[PDB]
Design a protein around this ligand. Structure first.
Ligand SMILES: C[C@@H]1CC[C@@]2(OC1)O[C@H]1C[C@H]3[C@@H]4CC=C5C[C@@H](OCCC(CO[C@H]6O[C@H](CO)[C@@H](O[C@H]7O[C@H](CO)[C@@H](O)[C@H](O)[C@H]7O)[C@H](O)[C@H]6O)CO[C@H]6O[C@H](CO)[C@@H](O[C@H]7O[C@H](CO)[C@@H](O)[C@H](O)[C@H]7O)[C@H](O)[C@H]6O)CC[C@]5(C)[C@H]4CC[C@]3(C)[C@H]1[C@@H]2C
Ligand SMILES: C[C@@H]1CC[C@@]2(OC1)O[C@H]1C[C@H]3[C@@H]4CC=C5C[C@@H](OCCC(CO[C@H]6O[C@H](CO)[C@@H](O[C@H]7O[C@H](CO)[C@@H](O)[C@H](O)[C@H]7O)[C@H](O)[C@H]6O)CO[C@H]6O[C@H](CO)[C@@H](O[C@H]7O[C@H](CO)[C@@H](O)[C@H](O)[C@H]7O)[C@H](O)[C@H]6O)CC[C@]5(C)[C@H]4CC[C@]3(C)[C@H]1[C@@H]2C
Ligand SMILES: COC1=C(OC)C(=O)C(C/C=C(\C)CC/C=C(\C)CC/C=C(\C)CC/C=C(/C)CC/C=C(\C)CC/C=C(\C)CC/C=C(\C)CC/C=C(/C)CCC=C(C)C)=C(C)C1=O
Ligand SMILES: CCCCCCCCCCCCCCCCCC(=O)O[C@@H](COC(=O)CCCCCCCCCCCCCCC)COP(=O)(O)OCC[N+](C)(C)C
Ligand SMILES: CCCCCCCCCCCCCCCCCC(=O)O[C@@H](COC(=O)CCCCCCCCCCCCCCC)COP(=O)(O)OC[C@H](O)CO
Ligand SMILES: CCCCCCCCCCCCCCCCCC(=O)O[C@@H](COC(=O)CCCCCCCCCCCCCCC)COP(=O)(O)OC[C@H](O)CO
Ligand SMILES: CCCCCCCCCCCCCCCCCCCC(=O)O[C@H](COC(=O)CCCCCCCCCCCCCC)COP(=O)(O)OCCN
Ligand SMILES: CCCCCCCCCCCCCCCCCCCC(=O)O[C@H](COC(=O)CCCCCCCCCCCCCC)COP(=O)(O)OCCN
Ligand SMILES: CCCCCCCCCCCCCCCCCCCC(=O)O[C@H](COC(=O)CCCCCCCCCCCCCC)COP(=O)(O)OCCN
Ligand SMILES: CCCCCCCCCCCCCCCCCC(=O)OC[C@H](COP(=O)(O)O)OC(=O)CCCCCCCCCCCCCCCCC
Ligand SMILES: COC1=C(OC)C(=O)C(C/C=C(\C)CC/C=C(\C)CC/C=C(/C)CC/C=C(\C)CCC=C(C)C)=C(C)C1=O
Lengths: 58, 94, 174, 100, 324, 64, 101, 488
């Protein structure tokens, strides 16, 4: 069971990777109000720009 | 859209700053070997091969059989060149 | 403004290509020029070409130049010369080229002077072309291998010539 | 003003290649480098025009020109290598024996 | 955009910590195979060892030998370190967990990989030492040689997916992980990753005892640390790429509610950890090739097999009309 | 003239090109196709459009 | 892939088959086509043999010359047969066989 | 689908045969069992065979080369003009190859890759002739150029050969960049690269006051590249150095085939396109400069190769006079001049290659040749008098047309220049005859007799040169046919 000593640094590396994912995910969500959408294309950008008008001018 | 490239630039700026901080804080307290040219040439050729592979790989669904065989002919020419290099000893470093 | 920054970087880096006393330094500045060019390509929306300029010009061609120039170990005495006496000949040739060739598009492509009015509202949006947008990569790949495949294959022949010539001119088998 | 700015960028690269030919009479490696600079400028000209004209022909030819530039540099550097090997030097006074 | 620097730091800082502890994990696993204890004095279970080593390095006087390439000598480690860092901007850790959702992300990764060679070349040339120069030339040649096979394997995955978007590459493996049908391609990719990161059995710069001086032999203090950190960050990145391309990234092993309970970032992390363990294990298990032998392997074995796999995958998918 | 657009649809100036080409394919004098030709070239470079808008900007700067 | 066989210069003989299939063209080979084929191949093998004697590889040289001659002769015979079926070459035999089957 | 490729049967065959020869050569040149035999002559004979089979395929399938023209339209354009140009190119390549075997075996130039590079350059020139778009034209030109760069440096331990290669690559790459810039300017100004589209856009306007400076400078840069390729003054100085420093078979090949290919390109670009009087003036001034400089520099030469190089520069000046005048007879005369100059150059280089077996270098080395080989001295004298344009030898056609156009376009300074340069040329051509027949040197050089290939080629070209004007009808008719086919 001594070999569990070697699993601690690997566990730390895994937690580090989980942080690099989740911290950037939550900061983006807090700033934009919704999570990042994978595959934002021309259509989605045009939708957001037109939706700014359709919301604010209502 | 090119919007997604802006975070990459800001990331580069921050990574550069981290590099300067780490490197700068301790300042406070005649034998030409042709085989390298030859390996450079081979890398150039296969670099262009990968370059031409990229659009083909994303376009296979639209170009169908004609595009497949045209790329096959391209590869046949380049692979004849590769066979020539292999036979001539360009791939041997001994 | 951003194009002013990138063009200034390219101008200085290119002058360094052509004026650095050490040829290894010239190769490194050349690499800076290709980086700036890639930036311009990103501004044009051509991300495939922007990446390919890094992969091929910097990743393969400049590496070849660097390997060759580094192993040459050129002494400055062999390639040194004073360039002060070229300022006039460069002045006339540069100016004539400057006066003719920086302004060649002006009569055909007259710039739109930016006015003190919001013209952005006159941008007309056609959503029909936005239902299924094509990347630069797939637009190019739709054409290279079918409608213009002969030119593709001739380029392959050019590369084969390069391989054969590289072997025949330099090979000394141990 | 976009198109004039993109064109003058490529134009300064081309003029720099010309100047590099003019200013490097004892340095033929830099002369080769200046020729690549001109080729890069032409490639940029094709890409800018493709966008401005909304036409793909400029892009196909740009890729093929990159292939030509690669082959050109490979063969040119091979010729440089063998010239150096024969003479032991790259100085221009040792490549002037053919004349008249 | 004001919050973008926070996201960037939330990527970069945990990555640097992860590298610091990857060094410790390598030491621990190597020791345990060798029936000894690795660092276990500096901190409990040796967990403070990386901080002590980093502190020692920053408190070490820099040397900067009297060369004529004063600027280049210090900038080479900066270049390699920055290149190791910037590849992570496009790496997705889970659905929507990615800094830059590049449509051309695969080619971008290839470009970064191709750029990696310049730090080593410039370090060798600028150091004013024939041994460093020769070692740097050999290492650079090895990296460019194995980059060809890496690119061709990338093309195989691209043919299967039909998009250069890394997240799309992950989500295309919902039906089956690409590592199952393309298992030999995955083995080839892992070996090519070993060779591309100058890792055992391909670690020429580590072969000082074999009369082969490394490219960083003249470096001290934080330039040497920058080279080391870039190398280990690249090891983590190669493990991540193996996970993304062949083990389905953040996807669970089986599409079942029991497996879907645990977050995708944890799946991704566990697969990355497996590949890092394999890195260490391989270094512990085998001797190293000579330069000529590994060059022969790069050009005579991995290139032909990669090209053959490209042809076979494309031909099969075209024939039965299974293309994306 | 090719018709292949940079975003995967018909090029912006291709219909003008085709009108000009179809005109020239049967008119024995090119002066009969001058209008269509200048329409094609105007689509490529927008020279007259931008010139007219610059006249408007000029008059605005003069009356201010 | 859109295709269009239409030639710039029209056929001057009756068009038996506008775009004949590969196997149809091969099956259309006449005695003269086979004579052309065999002559080209034989000359090529002979050149391979004679030019191979000095290097000492007359056998392999014969094989290489024969491969070149086989490919060239087959291409020439195919050219003639397809041109006859398409009406570009005098095709009395093709017309006679067409007016009967 | 397969039948569409009948339009490219000749090219497919030659490319495949070249690949076969590459594989054959590399497999057996490396053979320990066979003791690494030299394969330059074996591959040369097989490649001569391949060229002749390509010629058969092309000549016998004249209508078939136009099949599926709409499908191939955006790639190339085959017609009667390209038909005859390609046939002539293949014939020239076959002759040049046939002249190489004594060089292969006696020098022991064992590199079979030489033949492969020649064949690939022939493929490139074939595609050059049929090019109908700026992109295709550039690609084919580059393939041809890269093959020449490599073969110019084939004697890779020679100072001369390496110097030739280096000068060629640098100056060739520079000129190619200039031409590509011109192509980019034309595309940007017109949105087109296909020759038909360019013809439609540019016709009817030339310089109508509102001239596209982009179109005008694109044409100029393309013309500069073309003039470099045809070795027209002032873009000529690469040619004498490259011609002298390259291996003599390379020099013979470069002297003929690229001119045919590039003149096909020039005809189909400019003649078929439209900026107009400016470009004909370009070629007019370059023709005059080439005639004058070629005459004077050739008069200065003491070495045979350099003399022939400067002679070729002068003759391309004479030929470009025909392009300048812009008439059906001008094009016909240009073609007649190209054909006759090619045959004469083949004759001259067959003699030069025969004499290279005893290392001929200087004109004075020909002394007493009328004694040591009388029939060879007479044959070489006929070539010189033909070069001088003395009637009734075949060379008289170019002189006759030069003055015909001088009085047809209405140009008397051109006629004066032609008279003076013709007299200068006659002097330096008859100097060789004087050296072989009139001089009595103290030391003689005895030359080894030529091989059968060169003797037969010399015998046929010598009958043509002496007897062409007795039966010149087929050339006249075929060249008139080609000139007409450019527009109809
Ligand atoms: C050594 C040291 C030890 C200590 C330590 O360091 C190291 O150890 C380290 C270890 C770290 C933990 C590691 C992991 C997590 C999980 C994370 O939490 C899940 C992430 C969130 C989002 O991500 C999910 O969601 C994605 C999208 O679906 C999933 O994608 C799917 O779909 C893809 C496409 O099909 C497929 O491709 C994928 O395969 C498929 O899975 C993705 O996988 C999945 O992750 C969870 O979301 C939820 O939260 C939402 C909040 O809004 C709620 O929304 C709801 O409310 C809205 C408003 O009304 C409504 O509008 C909505 O409709 C309605 O749903 C709702 O509760 C629910 O959505 C919370 C953080 C934590 C605990 C970390 C903490 C810090 C540590 C303890 C570190 C610690 C420091
Ligand atoms: C892997 C290795 C590592 C190294 C590496 O790779 C290799 O790493 C790689 C990483 C690369 C960097 C990646 C990323 C960038 C950013 C880019 O920079 C974006 C600039 C573009 C985008 O800018 C805006 O774009 C939108 C506005 O356009 C903004 O949208 C708003 O406006 C919308 C409309 O109302 C609303 O709807 C939206 O809601 C609203 O938000 C958007 O927010 C904003 O981003 C272009 O913009 C400009 O262009 C304009 C046009 O010319 C100029 O207009 C001007 O001229 C006009 C007349 O012409 C006059 O009329 C005008 O009045 C007058 O102003 C003006 O200068 C300026 O706007 C510059 C290049 C660079 C640095 C790359 C360099 C090279 C690398 C380092 C590579 C490197 C090599
Ligand atoms: C024997 O092989 C080994 C090496 O190569 C010889 C190592 O370099 C190393 C160690 C190298 C490191 C620990 C580098 C770690 C660097 C970091 C985690 C980032 C910087 C960390 C610091 C504590 C520096 C702090 C700098 C500041 C300006 C303070 C403000 C923050 C080890 C452990 C090792 O085993
Ligand atoms: C009128 C034209 C305009 C002016 C130009 C004139 C150009 C010539 C200059 C004239 C001045 C005098 C020229 C003297 C040349 C005459 C001598 C001569 O050439 O004799 C040759 C003869 O050269 C020839 O071989 C000429 C052959 C040409 C064939 C042309 C005839 C075609 C049909 C004839 C059919 C065959 C013969 C029929 C009868 C048997 C002998 O060559 P040798 O080198 O001495 O020895 C040759 C070796 N051996 C004798 C052993 C074989
Ligand atoms: C390392 C791998 C080497 C592979 C070498 C072997 C293959 C080399 C390529 C040989 C040419 C094709 C041989 C394969 C025969 C099968 C062809 C076939 O199946 O016919 C298809 C058609 O295939 C072709 O016609 C493509 C031919 C490829 C071009 C090869 C070049 C031949 C000569 C070109 C002349 C140009 C000059 C050459 C320049 C150097 C039918 O398609 P379709 O008409 O139904 O629809 C078209 C398509 O599906 C939609 O886009
Ligand atoms: C028309 C071309 C037909 C095919 C050409 C064959 C290509 C190789 C033949 C080149 C000639 C040759 O082989 O030369 C050798 C021998 O030359 C030959 O014997 C000719 C070889 C065959 C050529 C003629 C045979 C019949 C060809 C008919 C057409 C096929 C070497 O000569 P040697 O060193 O033995 O000279 C010594 C002797 O004193 C010479 O006088
Ligand atoms: C002694 C007598 C010298 C008289 C020289 C007068 C030159 C004027 C010639 C002239 O009138 O211009 C046109 C040609 O000029 C030209 O062609 C330009 C002059 C020649 C150009 C090239 C000269 C280079 C000479 C080479 C050696 C120089 C070495 C310098 C380093 C001829 O009128 P036109 O025929 O066009 O009438 C067109 C009707 N259709
Ligand atoms: C038009 C004006 C009037 C012209 C009159 C034309 C009349 C027709 C010609 C009649 C020919 C009379 C001689 C016929 C018998 C000779 C048969 C040659 C026998 C032979 O096999 O020669 C072989 C060599 O190939 C060779 O020597 C043959 C190749 C020589 C080059 C021939 C042309 C090939 C390429 C085409 C070029 C076209 C150029 C056009 C621009 C081997 O000979 P060997 O046994 O003695 O040993 C040589 C040592 N290796
Ligand atoms: C592009 C093609 C370029 C070809 C250039 C012309 C061929 C080379 C000419 C040099 C050698 C031939 C000299 C001509 C022979 C001298 C007599 C001419 C002659 O009148 O005889 C007629 C032509 O014979 C001949 O056919 C001449 C011999 C074959 C050559 C036969 O008279 P004919 O009645 O049969 O022909 C209809 C004539 N009225
Ligand atoms: C065309 C499309 C693809 C193009 C690229 C690939 C082309 C295929 C590769 C061609 C490369 C050359 C292959 C040469 C093979 C020689 C084999 C060998 O060693 O032969 C010696 C071997 C044994 O003889 P030995 O040399 O006396 O031991 O075979 C012969 O010599 C057989 C001779 C009789 C053949 C006469 C009939 C030939 C007709 C055409 C087939
Ligand atoms: C004997 O005295 C001397 C000269 O005097 C002949 C000289 O020159 C020079 C040195 C200066 C030179 C050579 C500059 C001349 C260079 C030029 C004009 C560059 C162009 C190159 C060539 C070969 C000229 C070809 C161009 C021509 C004929 C005209 C251009 C084209 C058209 C009209 C279409 C020296 C030392 C000299 O001591």
């Amino acid at each position: 069971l001594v070999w569990l000593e070697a699993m601690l640094p690997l566990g730390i590396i895994g937690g580090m990777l989980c942080i690099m994912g989740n911290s950037q995910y939550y900061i983006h969500k807090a700033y934009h109000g919704r999570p990042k959408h994978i595959g934002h294309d021309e259509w989605d950008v045009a939708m957001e720009r037109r939706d700014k008008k359709v919301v604010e001018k209502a | 859209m090119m919007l997604e490239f802006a975070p990459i630039f800001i990331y580069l700026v921050i990574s550069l700053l981290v590099s300067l901080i780490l490197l700068g804080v301790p300042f406070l307290f005649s034998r030409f070997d042709i085989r390298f040219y030859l390996v450079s040439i081979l890398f150039l050729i296969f670099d262009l091969e990968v370059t031409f592979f990229f659009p083909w790989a994303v376009s296979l669904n639209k170009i169908d059989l004609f595009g497949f065989w045209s790329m096959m002919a391209f590869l046949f020419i380049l692979t004849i060149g590769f066979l020539y290099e292999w036979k001539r000893g360009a791939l041997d470093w001994e | 403004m951003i194009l002013s920054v990138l063009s200034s970087l390219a101008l200085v880096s290119g002058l360094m290509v052509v004026r650095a006393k050490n040829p290894v330094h010239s190769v490194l500045f050349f690499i800076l020029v290709f980086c700036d060019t890639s930036g311009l390509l990103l501004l044009l929306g051509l991300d495939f070409f922007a990446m390919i300029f890094l992969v091929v010009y910097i990743g393969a061609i400049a590496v070849l130049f660097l390997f060759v120039v580094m192993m040459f170990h050129i002494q400055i005495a062999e390639i040194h010369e004073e360039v002060l006496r070229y300022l006039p000949v460069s002045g006339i040739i540069g100016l004539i080229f400057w006066w003719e060739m920086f302004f060649i598009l002006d009569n055909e492509s007259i710039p739109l002077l930016p006015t003190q009015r919001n013209t952005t509202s006159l941008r007309y949006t056609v959503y029909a072309g936005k239902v299924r947008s094509w990347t630069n990569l797939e637009t190019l790949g739709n054409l290279l291998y079918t409608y213009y495949f002969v030119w593709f294959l001739v380029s392959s022949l050019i590369l084969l010539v390069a391989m054969i010539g590289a072997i025949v001119l330099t090979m000394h088998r141990t | 003003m976009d198109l004039i700015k993109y064109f003058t960028f490529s134009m300064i690269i081309f003029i720099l290649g010309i100047w590099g030919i003019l200013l490097n009479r004892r340095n033929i490696l830099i002369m080769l480098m200046s020729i690549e600079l001109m080729l890069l400028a032409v490639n940029l000209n094709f890409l800018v025009f493709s966008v401005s004209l909304d036409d793909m022909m400029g892009q196909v030819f740009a890729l093929l020109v990159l292939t030509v530039a690669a082959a050109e540099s490979a063969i040119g550097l091979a010729i440089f290598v063998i010239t150096f090997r024969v003479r032991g030097t790259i100085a221009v006074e040792f490549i002037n024996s053919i004349q008249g | 955009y004001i919050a973008v620097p926070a996201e960037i730091l939330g990527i970069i800082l945990p990555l640097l910590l992860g590298v610091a502890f990857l060094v410790l994990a390598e030491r621990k696993v190597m020791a345990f195979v060798q029936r000894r204890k690795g660092p276990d004095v500096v901190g409990s279970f040796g967990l403070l060892q990386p901080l002590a080593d980093g502190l020692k390095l920053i408190l070490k006087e820099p040397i900067s030998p009297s060369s004529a390439n004063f600027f280049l000598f210090r900038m080479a480690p900066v270049a390699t370190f920055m290149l190791s860092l910037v590849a992570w901007a496009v790496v997705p850790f889970d659905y929507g967990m990615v800094l830059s959702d590049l449509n051309i992300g695969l080619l971008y990764l290839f470009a970064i990989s191709s750029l990696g060679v310049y730090g080593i070349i410039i370090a060798g040339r600028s150091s004013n030492s024939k041994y460093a120069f020769l070692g740097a030339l050999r290492s650079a040649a090895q990296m460019v040689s194995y980059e060809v096979s890496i690119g061709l394997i990338l093309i195989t995955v691209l043919i299967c997916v039909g998009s250069c978007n890394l997240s799309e590459i992950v989500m295309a493996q919902k039906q089956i992980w690409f590592g199952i049908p393309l298992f030999p391609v995955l083995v080839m990719f892992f070996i090519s990753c070993l060779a591309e990161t100058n890792r055992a059995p391909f670690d020429l710069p580590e072969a000082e005892a074999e009369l082969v001086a490394g490219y960083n032999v003249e470096y001290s203090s934080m330039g040497f640390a920058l080279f080391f950190l870039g190398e280990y960050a690249n090891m983590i990145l190669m493990s991540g790429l193996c996970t993304l391309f062949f083990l389905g990234g953040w996807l669970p092993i089986l599409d079942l509610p029991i497996f879907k309970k645990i977050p995708g970032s944890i799946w991704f992390s566990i697969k990355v950890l497996f590949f890092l363990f394999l890195y260490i294990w391989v270094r512990a298990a085998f001797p190293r090739y000579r330069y000529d032998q590994l060059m022969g392997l790069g050009w005579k074995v991995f290139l032909p097999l990669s090209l053959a796999w490209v042809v076979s995958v494309s031909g099969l998918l075209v024939t039965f009309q299974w293309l994306p | 003239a090719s018709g292949w657009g940079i975003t995967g649809n018909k090029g912006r100036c291709y219909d003008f090109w085709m009108d000009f080409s179809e005109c020239m394919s049967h008119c024995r004098e090119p002066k009969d196709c001058t209008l269509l030709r200048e329409d094609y070239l105007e689509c490529l470079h927008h020279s007259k459009e931008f010139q007219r808008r610059n006249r408007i900007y000029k008059e605005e700067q003069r009356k201010l | 892939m859109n295709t269009d066989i239409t030639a710039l210069e029209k056929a001057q003989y009756p068009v038996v088959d506008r775009n004949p299939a590969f196997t149809k063209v091969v099956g259309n080979f006449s005695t003269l086509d086979y004579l052309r084929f065999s002559t080209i191949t034989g000359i090529s093998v002979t050149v391979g043999y004679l030019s191979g004697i000095k290097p000492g590889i007359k056998g392999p040289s014969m094989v290489t010359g024969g491969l070149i001659g086989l490919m060239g002769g087959f291409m020439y015979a195919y050219q003639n047969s397809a041109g006859r079926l398409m009406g570009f070459f005098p095709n009395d035999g093709e017309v006679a066989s067409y007016q009967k089957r | 689908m397969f039948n569409l490729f009948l339009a490219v049967f000749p090219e497919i065959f030659i490319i495949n045969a070249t690949f076969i020869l590459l594989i054959h050569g590399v497999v057996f040149s490396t053979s320990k069992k066979y003791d690494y035999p030299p394969l330059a002559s074996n591959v040369g004979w097989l490649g001569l065979l391949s060229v002749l089979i390509t010629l058969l395929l092309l000549a016998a399938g004249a209508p078939l080369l136009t099949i599926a023209h709409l499908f191939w339209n955006n790639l190339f354009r085959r017609d009667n003009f390209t038909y005859f140009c390609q046939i002539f190119l293949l014939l020239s390549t076959a002759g040049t190859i046939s002249m190489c075997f004594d060089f292969f075996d006696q020098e022991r130039f064992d590199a079979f890759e030489f033949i492969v590079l020649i064949l690939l350059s022939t493929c490139g020139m074939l595609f050059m002739i049929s090019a109908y778009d700026l992109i295709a034209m550039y690609l084919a030109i580059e393939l041809q150029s890269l093959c020449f760069y490599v073969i110019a440096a084939s004697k890779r331990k020679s100072e001369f050969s390496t110097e030739a290669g280096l000068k060629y690559l640098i100056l060739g790459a520079f000129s190619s960049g200039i031409l590509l810039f011109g192509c980019s300017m034309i595309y940007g100004s017109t949105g087109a690269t296909h020759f038909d589209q360019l013809a439609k856009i540019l016709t009817g306007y030339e310089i109508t006051g509102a001239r596209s400076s982009g179109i005008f400078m694109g044409i100029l840069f393309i013309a500069v590249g073309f003039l470099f390729k045809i070795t027209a003054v002032p873009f000529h100085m690469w040619a004498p150095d490259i011609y002298e420093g390259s291996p003599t078979p390379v020099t013979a090949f470069l002297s003929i085939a690229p001119k045919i290919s590039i003149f096909a390109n020039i005809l189909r670009v400019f003649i078929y396109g439209s900026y107009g009087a400016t470009l004909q003036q370009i070629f007019f001034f370059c023709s005059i400069a080439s005639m004058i400089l070629g005459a004077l520099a050739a008069m200065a030469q003491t070495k045979v190769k350099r003399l022939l190089a400067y002679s070729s520069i002068g003759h391309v000046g004479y030929i470009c006079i025909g392009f300048s005048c812009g008439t059906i007879e001008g094009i016909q005369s240009l073609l007649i001049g190209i054909f006759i100059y090619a045959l004469m150059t083949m004759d001259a280089f067959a003699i030069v290659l025969a004499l290279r077996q005893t290392r001929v270098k200087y004109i004075a080395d020909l002394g007493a040749l009328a004694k040591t080989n009388p029939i060879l001295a007479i044959t070489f004298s006929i070539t010189m008098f033909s070069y001088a344009g003395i009637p009734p030898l075949a060379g008289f056609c170019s002189k006759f047309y030069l003055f015909f156009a001088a009085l047809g376009c209405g140009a008397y300074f051109l006629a004066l220049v032609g008279v003076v340069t013709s007299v200068i040329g006659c002097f330096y051509y008859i100097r060789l005859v004087k050296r072989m027949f009139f001089d009595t040197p103290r030391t003689w050089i005895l030359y080894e007799p030529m091989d059968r290939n060169k003797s037969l080629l010399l015998a046929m070209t010598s009958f043509f040169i002496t007897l062409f004007l007795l039966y010149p009808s087929p050339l006249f008719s075929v060249t008139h046919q080609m000139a007409l086919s450019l527009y109809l």
